[PDB]
Each structure stands twice: as C-alpha cells, then as structure tokens.
Amino acid sequence: PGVLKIVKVYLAVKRRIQPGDKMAGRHGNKGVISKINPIEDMPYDENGTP
Amino acid sequence: EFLKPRLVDIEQVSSTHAKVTLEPLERGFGHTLGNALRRILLSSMPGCAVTEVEIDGVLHEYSTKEGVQEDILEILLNLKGLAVRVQGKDEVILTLNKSGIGPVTAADITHDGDVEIVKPQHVICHLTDENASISMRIKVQRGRGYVPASTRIHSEEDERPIGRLLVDACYSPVERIAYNVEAARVEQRTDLDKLVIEMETNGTIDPEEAIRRAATILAEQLEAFVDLRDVEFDPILLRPVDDLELTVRSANCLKAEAIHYIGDLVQRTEVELLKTPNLGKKSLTEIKDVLASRGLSLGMRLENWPPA
Amino acid sequence: GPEEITADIPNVGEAALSKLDESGIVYIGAEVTGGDILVGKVTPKGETQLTPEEKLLRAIFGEKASDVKDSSLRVPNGVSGTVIDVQVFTRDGVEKDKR
C-alpha cells in the first residue's frame, strides 16, 4: 500500500579473463594466472603450433 | 664474405597453406633468420577485419531476432571470423540483405567495388521461415594487432547511437607459421643451409608479400643499431596584477614591492605583508576581499616561478 | 504526496537526460557506466509558507521552482554494461505508463 509503482533494470557485463582470475582443472589443481603471454613467446612444437 | 640469401622456389599447397624457400644461407644464419622472421610474421602483420556491425531490428548484442536460428551474440562471433581483402580503402562498408529459407553465406554480401571475399562458403546465419528477412551493415577497417572492443574509447569521441554492436578485431592474417633448416643441394661449396617456411594464413595476404614485409620491418628496426653514436600553470595565474580592480594607494605600494603578477601576491602569508609601509588595515582587507573573489585564498605555496 | 516518476528532473543537465525516454526510463540497449541516471523518481517536499524570495524563485523559474526533491536510482561506481530489460509494474486504478 505504500508502494505505488515499481521498476526493475537489468544490466549485462561481459567479464574477460585477466591475470588475477582463478583457474583450475577437475583434479584439484587450482591456480591464479600470472601473465598473458603473446603468441610468439609460448613454446611451440615442430609443426609450429604453440 | 657471406652469401646473400635469395627468394626462390615459392609454391602454394592450397589457398592458405604456403611454402617459401630461401636456398643460400651460411652456417648459423638459418636459425637466426627463421626465428626472427617467425616472430615478426606472427607479431605484426597488417590485415583487415570486421570492426562494427549494425542490424536493422536489434538493439543490443544480447537480443534475439525473429526468423533467424542464431542469437545476435553467435552472429557477431561468426562475423568476427570473416576474411576480406580490401584495396585502396580503410573504412569500407559492406551491406548484406537476404530473405528466404536456408543458410545465408558470405557470398550474398553485395559486391562492393574493390572488396574480395577470400572464402564465400562462410555461413554466418540461418533463415528459418519464408517471410523473415535479414538486412545488416558491416563496417570493416584495416589494422595491425589485436585490439579489444572494450579498450577502444576514441570511437566514443563521437556519440554512437544505440544499435551499434561493437565487435573485437584481430587484424592478423598469419594463423600459423613454422620454419625448418636443411642442408643445401649446392655441391661446389663445402656445406650450405636452406630455409623453408610454411605459413597457414586466412588467405588475406600473399606469402611472398608477407616475407618481404617482415624483412623490411627487421631492416628498419636494425637501422637504429647500424649507427649507435650517443657517446604555476593554470591560466588564472601568470596574469599581471593590474586587473584585480585595486585602489590607488595599493597600486604604487604594489609596484614598490615588485608584485607584478597575481600569483606572487597569493604566496604572501598574512603576518608578513602587514610590515609593508602604508599597507593599511582597511586596504589590506580590500586586497583580501578582491583576491578571494577570484577564489585564490591568501597563503598558497608554489614550487617554481617562471618569469612570464 | 506521491513520488511520481518523470523524465524531467530538476537541476540536472541535458547531458544526463540523453538516455531517458518520454516516461523517465533508460532506453533498452543504452550503454551505462559510472553514475548515469536510470529512472527519474522525484519525491515532493513540504512547503506552505510562500516567502517573498520563494515567490520570486517560483516566478523566475518553473512552477515547482525545483522544490521537488530528486531521488533517482543510479549505477553504483564500478558497475558497467548495457541495459537489457525493464519490467515496470502498475497499481490498479493508477494511470498506466506509456511503456
């Protein structure tokens, strides 16, 4: 009875990955990212796929 | 004393896969050139990728359009992978209109003057009824490296109307590159090296042009090493004092104590300028009155004083 | 009285009203960050002694003369994104919103 009108607003935000974001497998090996390396700096095998 | 490598025996496996051969090379230069060229080619290769997309009926990337099978998010993800080659332009607009049943592919996009679609079988959306139509405009640019949509703000220097869906850009055509070194077929020399580079791109850039561009970039960077050598601000201040609308008995006294700027008057603490001859208690308040009218409270502390 | 909801908000610049509709709700799809206005909700204030300064203020400015207090929902700092949906609801008997 005090209320006369109600309005509700929804926002959406796309969160990306970044150094501090926590990542883990499903064997219990957790961790925190440390550096987002550029493509050419990662180790690559004989066929060039990093 | 060193043989100069030459570009010879360039062949293409497919429209994307390519092999490039550099036959004459010395002992240690094969690996050095291979790694440097791989890093240059992967890091910074000019290319073209979709920058923004405007669809007629949508309002935001998290909406659903009636008559299509995919959400607008998936349509944007599909467009992000579009491969297009432009010539002589850098802000080219692509329009796409289609009505009917079935997949809508990149071949439907209206034929622009100088725009080549490397692959036209690239499905981007599906129309699932007879009476639904899609009409959308794609603005595609030219760039160098990965640039997220979020990190660009200069595009908001001009206000963007609602309906502009910003997408991320990649700009890098070279998806994969590997190199290898082998013993050369030259028999007159004791032993020579031959370098083979395989590159898998999106088809936007020719392999030979890529190798030439990488070599030019490396040479330009080396040009630095070829010769080493090398072996009080706000407009309110810096303003002459003869504008504060001061009294006559102040002007001569103000000039007598070498106060020619507004700022140096502010830096005078209260207890010390009262020692000035004929300053005047009522007059001093008037200086404090008109100076505080500008918001400059007496007794501020500056670091350096320019002479202008 | 009633805390009526309107687009027009006293003592707020036209820049902050760029994203407000004719009813006072952010357009669906507008991008919001920082402390942008979401809905213009004004709370009436109490005043019944028309002082001469008050009457001059009412004469030089609008009829309300900005006596209605502005209590508008705003984005808390550090929150960003694009507006997705608005789900306004009405009491029976009261005039329904345009939206």
3-state secondary structure B150-191: CCCCHHHCCCCCCCEEECCECCCCEEEEEEEEEECCCCCCCC
User: What is C25-88 written as a DSSP string?
Assistant: BBPTT-EEETT-EEE-BEE--------HHHHHHHHHS-SSTT-SEE--EEPPTT-EEEEEEE--
Q: Which of C19, C26, C84, C85 to mutate to test the interface with B (most CBs of B within 10 A)?
A: C84
DSSP lists the bridge partners of residue C26 as C20
Q: What is the dihedral of CA B185, B189, B190, B192, to 10 degrees?
A: -50
Nearest to A11 among C3, C82, C88 (CB): C82
Q: CA–CA separation, B131 vs B129, rounded Å?
A: 6
A45: nearest CA partner in chain B: B178
Beta-carbon separation of A7 and C75 below 8 A = no
Query: What length does chain B have?
Result: 308
**Gaps in chain A following residue numbers (C to N > 2.5 A):** none
Most distant CA pair in chain A: distance in Å? 73
Q: Between B and C, how many residue pairs show a Cβ–Cβ distance under 8 A?
A: 16
3-state secondary structure of A34: coil
Chain C within 8 Å of B153 (Cβ-Cβ)?
no
* Close Cβ partners of B43 (under 8 Å, ≥ 6 residues apart): A38, A39, A40, B145
Nearest to C84 among B62, B159, B162 (CB): B62
Query: Among all chains, which residue has been given the structure tokens 């509700």?
Result: A8
DSSP classification of residue B108: G
C26: nearest CA partner in chain A: A9
Q: CA–CA separation, B20 vs B37, rounded Å?
A: 12
Q: CA–CA separation, C81 vs C89, rounded Å?
A: 24
Query: Among all chains, which residue has been given the structure tokens 């994104």?
Result: C81
Q: CA–CA separation, B229 vs B221, rounded Å?
A: 16
Which method was used? cryo-EM
Q: Which of B307, B306, B302 is CA-nearest to residue B267?
A: B302
Beta-carbon separation of B60 and C28 below 8 A = yes
Beta-carbon separation of A40 and B43 below 8 A = yes
H or E stretch at B132: strand B123-143
Chain C within 8 Å of A11 (Cβ-Cβ)?
yes
Structure tokens at B125: 């959306």
Q: CA–CA separation, A20 vs B115, rounded Å?
A: 42
Q: CA–CA separation, B51 vs B67, rounded Å?
A: 25
